Amino acid sequence: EKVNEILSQLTLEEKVKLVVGVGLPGLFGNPHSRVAGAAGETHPVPRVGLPAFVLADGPAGLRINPTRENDENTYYTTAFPVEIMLASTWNRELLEEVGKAMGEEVREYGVDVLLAPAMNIHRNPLCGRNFEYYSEDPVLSGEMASSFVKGVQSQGVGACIKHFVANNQETNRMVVDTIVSERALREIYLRGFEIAVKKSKPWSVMSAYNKLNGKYCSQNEWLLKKVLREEWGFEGFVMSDWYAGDNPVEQLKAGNDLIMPGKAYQVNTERRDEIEEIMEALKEGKLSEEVLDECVRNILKVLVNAPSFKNYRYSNKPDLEKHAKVAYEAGAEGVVLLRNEEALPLSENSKIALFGTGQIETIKGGTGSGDTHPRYAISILEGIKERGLNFDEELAKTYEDYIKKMRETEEYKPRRIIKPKLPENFLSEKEIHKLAKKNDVAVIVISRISGEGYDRKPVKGDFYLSDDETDLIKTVSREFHEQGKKVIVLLNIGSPVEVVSWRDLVDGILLVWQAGQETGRIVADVLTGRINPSGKLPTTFPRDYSDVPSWTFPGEPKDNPQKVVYEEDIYVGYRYYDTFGVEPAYEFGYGLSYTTFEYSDLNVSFDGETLRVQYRIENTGGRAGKEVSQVYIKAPKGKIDKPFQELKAFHKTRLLNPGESEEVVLEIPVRDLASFNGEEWVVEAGEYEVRVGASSRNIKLKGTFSVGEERRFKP
Numbered sequence: 001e002k003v004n005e006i007l008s009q010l011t012l013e014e015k016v017k018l019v020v021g022v023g024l025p026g027l028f029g030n031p032h033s034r035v036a037g038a039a040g041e042t043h044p045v046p047r048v049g050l051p052a053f054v055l056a057d058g059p060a061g062l063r064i065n066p067t068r069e070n071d072e073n074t075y076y077t078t079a080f081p082v083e084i085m086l087a088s089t090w091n092r093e094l095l096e097e098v099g100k101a102m103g104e105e106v107r108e109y110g111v112d113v114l115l116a117p118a119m120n121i122h123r124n125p126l127c128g129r130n131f132e133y134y135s136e137d138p139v140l141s142g143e144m145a146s147s148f149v150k151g152v153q154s155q156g157v158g159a160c161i162k163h164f165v166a167n168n169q170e171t172n173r174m175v176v177d178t179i180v181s182e183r184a185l186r187e188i189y190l191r192g193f194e195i196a197v198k199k200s201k202p203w204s205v206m207s208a209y210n211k212l213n214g215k216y217c218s219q220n221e222w223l224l225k226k227v228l229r230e231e232w233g234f235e236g237f238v239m240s241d242w243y244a245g246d247n248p249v250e251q252l253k254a255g256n257d258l259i260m261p262g263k264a265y266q267v268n269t270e271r272r273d274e275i276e277e278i279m280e281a282l283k284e285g286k287l288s289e290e291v292l293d294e295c296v297r298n299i300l301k302v303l304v305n306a307p308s309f310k311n312y313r314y315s316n317k318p319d320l321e322k323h324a325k326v327a328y329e330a331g332a333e334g335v336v337l338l339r340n341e342e343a344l345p346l347s348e349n350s351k352i353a354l355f356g357t358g359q360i361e362t363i364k365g366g367t368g369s370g371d372t373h374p375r376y377a378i379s380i381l382e383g384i385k386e387r388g389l390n391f392d393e394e395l396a397k398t399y400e401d402y403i404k405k406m407r408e409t410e411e412y413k414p415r416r417i418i419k420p421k422l423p424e425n426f427l428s429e430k431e432i433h434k435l436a437k438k439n440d441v442a443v444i445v446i447s448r449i450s451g452e453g454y455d456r457k458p459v460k461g462d463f464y465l466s467d468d469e470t471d472l473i474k475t476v477s478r479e480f481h482e483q484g485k486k487v488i489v490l491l492n493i494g495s496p497v498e499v500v501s502w503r504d505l506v507d508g509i510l511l512v513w514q515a516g517q518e519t520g521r522i523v524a525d526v527l528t529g530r531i532n533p534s535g536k537l538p539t540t541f542p543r544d545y546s547d548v549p550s551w552t553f554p555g556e557p558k559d560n561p562q563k564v565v566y567e568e569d570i571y572v573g574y575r576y577y578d579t580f581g582v583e584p585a586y587e588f589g590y591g592l593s594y595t596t597f598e599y600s601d602l603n604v605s606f607d608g609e610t611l612r613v614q615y616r617i618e619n620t621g622g623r624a625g626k627e628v629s630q631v632y633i634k635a636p637k638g639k640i641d642k643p644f645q646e647l648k649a650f651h652k653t654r655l656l657n658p659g660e661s662e663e664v665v666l667e668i669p670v671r672d673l674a675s676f677n678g679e680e681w682v683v684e685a686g687e688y689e690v691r692v693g694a695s696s697r698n699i700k701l702k703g704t705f706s707v708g709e710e711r712r713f714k715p
């Protein structure tokens with residue numbers, strides 16, 4: 001009634017104003033948002049009591065300006081582990097807590113909609129934004145997104161899942177035509193969004209930059225209307241990615257309700273002011289007022305529940321200390337232990353020789369709209385210092401002096417904002433021999449960063465180790481093994497890198513990802529064993545880049561892609577490696593622990609409507625720890641080709657003490673068993689295999705059930 005009331009009072013022009021952003025705030029000619037640094041604002045209409053609503057990034061935490069002009073107050077935010085690390089936790093409960101924490105900050109800093117989470121599929125490891133997406137798998141991705149959204153929206157503010165859909169590379173994202181079969185769309189790319197939309201009901205969806213099978217996502221009626229609304233029952237509103245598309249009236253007709261950030265002419269000379277174009281379209285009858293009304297109603301039905309609509313007095317003082325704890329917990333459960341040949345955790349008071357410039361230039365997250373401005377960011381060295389761990393104080397100072405010396409030089413000083421990659425092999429072969437005799441263990445930091453706007457390359461220094469990095473590892477490993485001592489590598493990265501070439505040279509490998517402000521503290525605590533690694537890969541680590549099935553990336557022509565075809569189709573990530581027998585370096589769902597777990601007591605039952613899978617996990621080791629279990633279903637070959645297996649459920653146990661067990665009970669609706677044959681979702685009759693694994697390739701328990709009657713579901 002409120003909506004219909006306001007809507008009936010709005011003039012034609014006011015309605016048009018409402019469906020377009022007010023321009024990128026604080027840039028070009030534009031005024032700062034009332035929340036300085038916010039990504040966008042809507043047009044206010046005081047006439048009928050409508051305020052401007054505020055939208056802000058992002059996935060790693062709220063991104064706003066830490067300071068303001070003529071202002072003595074602080075506006076620092078919490079910088080959380082990046083999404084790929086959050087996904088590595090495989091912990092829904094925890095994702096919800098992260099959402100609540102962020103949501104509280106969103107609310108109290110005067111923001112109405114958080115531009116998160118990002119949930120595009122990891123099609124290819126080279127995508128520059130992989131760090132801020134969850135997984136190569138739609139179920140993990142959708143489930144983690146759902147938990148996050150619920151946490152955010154329990155705080156009276158809105159989330160926004162992005163980017164819908166198939167935004168799986170950065171190269172020419174604003175222009176590239178993405179060619180994908182409807183099957184790959186429904187099973188892989190749409191699927192995570194479908195799960196999120198139905199389970200967590202986000203206030204909003206952001207349409208992607210790219211074209212999908214010939215049409216901009218922001219101008220795609222099939223995507224935004226037929227699928228999103230008519231099929232899925234989406235009740236929120238759709239906004240465009242910033243400056244996406246080329247036609248404002250086509251956007252509204254397609255079901256893209258809110259055009260952001262507005263004033264596209266400020267960035268692209270060939271674009272008209274969208275308000276003027278829309279007004280003209282209405283005058284000439286290219287656009288009906290009824291279409292406009294529906295778009296306005298979609299926005300208002302959501303935003304009348306926003307804090308700004310009720311003049312909420314935000315405090316500007318969220319409980320950061322409480323949020324820092326949540327950030328720590330998230331990073332703690334998201335570290336992945338990839339290798340441990342009796343190397344971790346480190347013995348108490350062990351003398352550590354810390355290597356790698358990344359020990360100091362620790363990467364807390366990726367760059368772009370998903371960046372953050374925390375009050376502090378604890379480097380790996382600082383974290384070890386803080387915990388009072390025994391390290392080579394001499395060596396640390398040497399590193400500190402070397403970095404400062406390098407960042408001063410013309411070649412390695414920061415330009416425009418990039419930091420040239422520093423040489424890592426600046427130690428003499430004899431110098432390191434010294435370290436091997438003096439210290440007990442070696443710990444090597446390998447760092448990578450990436451970000452919005454750029455894809456990674458399959459070359460040394462990016463996907464592959466640089467020669468200097470390889471030489472460092474080779475020398476450190478030889479010298480320390482010489483002394484009978486262990487060497488550990490910490491992977492401070494945002495997406496997979498080559499590991500096969502060097503992994504057999506070291507004893508321990510900790511995938512530390514990029515863990516936000518608390519990184520150093522998490523890393524130190526993992527090293528000592530205060531934290532028992534419970535993370536598992538949400539993405540496949542290929543032996544070599546050439547093994548990756550999404551070979552068409554980044555499209556054609558390579559240097560300036562106008563199109564990219566998803567030739568691998570549904571066979572992306574582990575679906576490919578399992579189905580066609582290609583062995584990964586480390587598989588989807590892989591992760592080690594400082595303790596051991598035994599799986600037992602499998603019971604599988606199916607009542608025609610629900611698949612029920614039960615089993616027990618016991619801690620059979622000597623240290624407390626959590627275990628992530630994964631339920632894969634292998635469908636019968638039947639009528640249509642299908643992947644070897646597909647993740648359908650997953651679970652993470654409580655913190656189990658030695659000897660403790662927990663009974664796991666997971667239910668899977670029959671519909672989730674379907675494959676899409678191009679027309680309909682079909683659950684084929686026949687025998688299905690239930691595979692309960694500690695990873696996609698470490699199946700602990702197997703059972704079968706049967707579907708007696710074929711089930712069909714029309715979209």
Ligand SMILES: OC[C@H]1O[C@@H](O)[C@H](O)[C@@H](O)[C@@H]1O
Pocket residue numbers: 039057115162241242369
């Ligand atoms: O900053 C607003 C938006 O900018 C765009 O370039 C990104 O693709 C979005 O993820 C972001 O929310």
Ligand SMILES: [Br-]
Pocket residue numbers: 119120121165166167168189190
């Ligand atoms: Br996607």
Ligand SMILES: [Br-]
Pocket residue numbers: 338339503
């Ligand atoms: Br290994």
Ligand SMILES: [Br-]
Pocket residue numbers: 131448449450493494495
């Ligand atoms: Br990276």
Ligand SMILES: [Br-]
Pocket residue numbers: 552555556563564565
């Ligand atoms: Br192609």
